[PDB]
Amino acid sequence: AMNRYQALFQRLSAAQQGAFVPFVTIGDPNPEQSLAIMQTLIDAGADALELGMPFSDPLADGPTIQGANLRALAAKTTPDICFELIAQIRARNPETPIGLLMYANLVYARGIDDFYQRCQKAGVDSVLIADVPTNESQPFVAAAEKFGIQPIFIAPPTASDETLRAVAQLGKGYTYLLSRAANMPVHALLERLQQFDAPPALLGFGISEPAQVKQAIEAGAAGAISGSAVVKIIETHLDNPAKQLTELANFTQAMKKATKI
Amino acid sequence: AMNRYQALFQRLSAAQQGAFVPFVTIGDPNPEQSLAIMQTLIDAGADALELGMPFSDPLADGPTIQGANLRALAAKTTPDICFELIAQIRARNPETPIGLLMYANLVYARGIDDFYQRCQKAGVDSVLIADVPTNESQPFVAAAEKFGIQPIFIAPPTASDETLRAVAQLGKGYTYLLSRAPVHALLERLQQFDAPPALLGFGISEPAQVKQAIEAGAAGAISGSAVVKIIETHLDNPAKQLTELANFTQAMKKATKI
Numbered sequence: 001a002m003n004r005y006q007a008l009f010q011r012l013s014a015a016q017q018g019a020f021v022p023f024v025t026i027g028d029p030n031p032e033q034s035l036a037i038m039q040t041l042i043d044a045g046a047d048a049l050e051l052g053m054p055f056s057d058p059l060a061d062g063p064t065i066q067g068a069n070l071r072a073l074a075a076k077t078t079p080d081i082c083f084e085l086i087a088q089i090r091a092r093n094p095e096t097p098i099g100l101l102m103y104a105n106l107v108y109a110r111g112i113d114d115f116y117q118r119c120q121k122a123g124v125d126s127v128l129i130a131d132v133p134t135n136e137s138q139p140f141v142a143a144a145e146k147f148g149i150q151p152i153f154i155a156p157p158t159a160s161d162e163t164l165r166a167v168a169q170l171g172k173g174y175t176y177l178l179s180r181a182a183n184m185p186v187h188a189l190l191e192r193l194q195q196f197d198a199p200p201a202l203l204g205f206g207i208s209e210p211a212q213v214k215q216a217i218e219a220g221a222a223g224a225i226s227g228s229a230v231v232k233i234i235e236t237h238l239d240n241p242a243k244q245l246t247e248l249a250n251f252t253q254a255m256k257k258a259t260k261i
Numbered sequence: 262a263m264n265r266y267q268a269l270f271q272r273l274s275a276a277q278q279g280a281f282v283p284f285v286t287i288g289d290p291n292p293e294q295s296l297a298i299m300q301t302l303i304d305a306g307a308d309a310l311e312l313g314m315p316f317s318d319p320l321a322d323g324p325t326i327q328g329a330n331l332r333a334l335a336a337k338t339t340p341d342i343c344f345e346l347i348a349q350i351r352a353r354n355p356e357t358p359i360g361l362l363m364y365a366n367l368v369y370a371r372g373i374d375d376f377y378q379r380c381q382k383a384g385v386d387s388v389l390i391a392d393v394p395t396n397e398s399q400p401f402v403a404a405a406e407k408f409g410i411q412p413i414f415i416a417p418p419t420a421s422d423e424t425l426r427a428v429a430q431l432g433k434g435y436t437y438l439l440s441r442a443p444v445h446a447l448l449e450r451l452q453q454f455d456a457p458p459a460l461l462g463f464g465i466s467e468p469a470q471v472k473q474a475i476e477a478g479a480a481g482a483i484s485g486s487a488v489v490k491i492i493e494t495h496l497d498n499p500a501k502q503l504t505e506l507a508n509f510t511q512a513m514k515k516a517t518k519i
Contacts, residue, residue, distance in 0.1 A: 057392045058417050058439055059485070063322040105392050108369035131318045131366055156319055178319055205320075 019223025025068035027077025045256035048097035090123030128152035134166035210258035280481025286329035288338025305510035309358035351384030389413035429456035442477035471516035
């Protein structure tokens, strides 16, 4: 029977909407507030969550998500903590698809198979391994398959046929369409992905305005994902937890509204 | 019994100079030219090399290092090739220290022991694991010890004490600092804990930053992205690309005179 994303997309299409998926780092600014943040996103109309686990990368300091990683680490977030938090979100929201956007480091650290087992225990739907190409993805996918987890791949504009083949054969759930930006390349790739029979596309890069969401859907994507812009809201109101939440709800409502009509 | 870095710093100390260490991505812009680039850097007075292996991280924000990865990968650079190029540089330059700056991904991918064994075979002196904190570095430090490789760690200024005695204890070769020229202070504790000599690696792209690093008390400076930017801006003319790298490396090394 249908996985959570297959059902989401069919239900949304019947409602003539696309999907809005916000991204947050788990444990930012601390576990308890991160739990409130995740629930607030769901309650305000996020169609699924995309979630990152924190790790240190001092050479890459500066961008918003790295900023989140530092806060979560300062709060002593560990992967065990991240899985406990995901479990609680899953228990309270049994229908909401939950995807993880991981870097390989933490997935290898305690064994690949171990990681995906923990994913199944916590109720994760999908895992996107940000920094391993499709042609090296075999042990990730084998693990994902064993634990019923949908593998999510990135498909850049330049994607080769053998890359898109892999996406369609190995990937489930959705395809992460990274577009760093005239419209023809995006239109070309959406059409290509369908011809290869890949999972539905979410446009995922630099998406910060409601109009970008509406445009993604108009071009034919299934929805859009917003990284930085959700995390930025958390950073802007670090001093005031209550306003973090009301601003995250307001932003989420605006972005989800742009998925309609 | 001195590793390549100890023999280096002994020499540099006698010559009244600090260290200049450029960074490049192995195989950027293709393997043959990368081999010319590495030799050009050494010939032009680089005291050691810091070298990366390319991999794809399309979500990353960091255009210089990203473009280097993309270039090297489009030219079909693989880890096997990286080790072959390293071995050639080593044969031709028996004394020059060669440090790898790696992300964990590639080190785990075919096994940690395997990776450090290939470093040994290739004549690599040190490995810095960019994305694993000292207090999680046990399996890297063990494989490093097993195969005679020196582990290098980053000491961020935010870091405290036990993080910092761990860096001085576990680390060998040099210590990588992201402080800019707080820095007097952080260098003080490092030397107080017997850390390996400290190199400044944040935003070092002009000779005046190299002189400032040394004046500040550091043993030298690492230019983390500047050399890659010269590659990037002279892609259409390989011979010029090499002339610009020689000139830049010369001017950076000169700035190391105490």
